[PDB]
A paper describes a structure:
If Arg85 is really involved in generating the additional stability/interaction, then, owing to cooperativity, mutation of this residue would have a greater effect in the super-agonistic variants (decrease in binding affinity) compared to wild-type IL-4. In contrast, the affinity of the IL-4 variant T13D-R85A is decreased 6.5-fold and its dissociation rate reflects IL-4 wild-type-like binding kinetics. An even bigger effect is observed for the variant F82D-R85A. To exclude the possibility that structural changes in addition to the removal of the Arg85 side chain play a role in the changes in binding stability, we determined the structures of the IL-4 variants R85A, T13D-R85A and F82D-R85A. No changes in the local structure around residues Thr/Asp13, Phe/Asp82 or Arg85 could be observed (data not shown).
Interleukin 4 (IL-4) is a pleiotropic cytokine that plays a major regulatory role in the immune system. Signal transduction of IL-4 is mediated by a sequential binding process, initiated first by binding of IL-4 to its high-affinity single membrane spanning receptor chain IL-4Rα. This intermediate ligand receptor complex then recruits one of two possible low-affinity receptor subunits, the common gamma chain (γc) or the IL-13Rα1 chain, into the functional hetero-trimeric complex to initiate signalling. The overall structure of IL-4 comprises the known four-helical bundle in up-up-down-down topology, which like the crystal packing is unaffected by these mutations.
Author numbering: 1 to 129
Amino acid sequence: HKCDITLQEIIKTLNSLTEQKTLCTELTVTDIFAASKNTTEKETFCRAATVLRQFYSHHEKDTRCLGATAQQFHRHKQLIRDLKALDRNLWGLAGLNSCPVKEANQSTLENFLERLKTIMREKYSKCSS
C-alpha cells in the first residue's frame, strides 16, 4: 500500500507539472507545508489533495488563466488535466477526505508543486533500496 506504484504516478505527473508554465502558476494555494510538521502521512496527502482541488476548481474557468492564444489555452487545459490526475492519485493515497487545513501562508502553485515533488520523491527513495 505505502510503497505502491501510485507514488510513481504522482511523481510522473509532478515532473510534468513543474516544467509547465502558464498564466496562473503564480496564483496561490494554502501552504500546507508551512506547518510545524504535525500530521500523519494520509493527513498530509489529504491536505495536499484538498488545496489542489480548491485551485483547479477555482481556476479552470478563470478569465485570467484561460488564455488568448491556442498555445496558452492548450497549456491551461493541460495544467488543469494534470492537477486533476495528481489530485485523484493523492485522494487514492490519502484514504481520507476530511482534513482541515489551517495555514495562513499562501505560496504560489509553482512553489507548492515543487515542494510536494520533493516530499514524494523522498517517500519513493525511502521505499526502494
